[PDB]
Design a protein around this ligand. Structure first.
Ligand code: HEM
Ligand code: HEM
Lengths: 135, 135
């Protein structure tokens, strides 16, 4: 990621974290509402916080691997697919936007957009490996 | 890292791979010669190809995890320390420049410098995590 992105990411986590409940809450209603096909895969409260937590170590993502790895098994067990990553991201960024309000500036959203992507790639790679190794 | 240094890593990995052999032998002679304290921990031929391999995936380091994971266990069994990381990189980058010659322009070196660092931390994290998990 570009420093500014990384910079905005480090700067906004707190504001983000301060608004978790809502973000999370709005996040789930919207996820289930607009994407009925995933409803079967499923509540999990720590989605937003997990992302925020990863975002914070965005300069040392390896640090989060132990947790990233506990979660992967669950994901693989539930049929999570790399293709689901984008709709979770879309709903997340929407909640983020919805809750920032005015601070939800363009470049802020964009950077969060970049961040989730990178973040998603760790789970998305680990699970691939998990599915690959499931034989 | 910055998609620039990244652009230089990708561009030069092929060059580095062509001279792999020489970098390898120069790397070792020098490693053990210049830093006698690590000789007890030990000439794995793939130290250089492994880094080059990683640099390839510098945009998706999680791709390398399964390999990184099998190596970490060996490393931890041998008592490799985060503190050792820097000598290795010093010795590898030295081979790199001593082998490229005048192509070994400073920015190339500097890019490789950042690259190894990034690569090192994945090993460092995993290992730190192995050490901690043991118990
Ligand atoms: C980076 C993006 C994601 C993060 C950070 C993440 C995070 C989480 C977390 C923290 C848990 C609960 C683990 C536990 O403590 O048991 C979880 C469970 C789950 N996640 Fe994700 N997830 C991500 C992407 C997705 C995607 C794209 C899907 C696709 C629908 C998904 C589906 C699920 C499901 C179905 C569960 C399991 C419910 C259960 O059995 O506990 N996740 N996820
Ligand atoms: C990213 C940096 C490093 C890479 C890519 C790396 C790579 C390797 C490879 C590929 C192996 C052999 C694994 C196998 O196939 O069994 C290995 C083993 C080893 N490495 Fe590293 N290494 C790195 C950093 C270091 C450092 C900093 C030290 C400090 C001395 C170190 C010490 C050793 C030792 C002692 C062995 C084990 C020899 C054996 O038991 O076979 N490595 N390393």
């Amino acid at each position: 990621l570009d420093q500014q992105t990384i910079n905005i990411i480090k700067a906004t986590v707190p504001v983000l974290k301060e608004h978790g409940v809502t973000i999370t809450t709005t996040f789930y209603k919207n996820l289930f509402a607009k994407h009925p096909e995933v409803r079967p895969l499923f509540q999990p409260k720590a989605l937003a916080m997990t992302v925020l937590a990863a975002a914070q170590n965005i300069e040392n993502l390896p640090a989060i691997l132990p947790a990233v790895k506990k979660i992967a098994v669950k994901h693989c067990q539930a049929g999570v697919a790399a293709a689901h990553y984008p709709i979770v991201g879309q709903e997340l960024l929407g909640a983020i936007k919805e809750v920032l309000g005015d601070a939800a500036t363009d470049d802020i959203l964009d950077a969060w957009g970049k961040a989730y992507g990178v973040i998603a790639d760790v789970f998305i790679q680990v699970e691939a490996d998990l599915y690959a190794q499931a034989v």
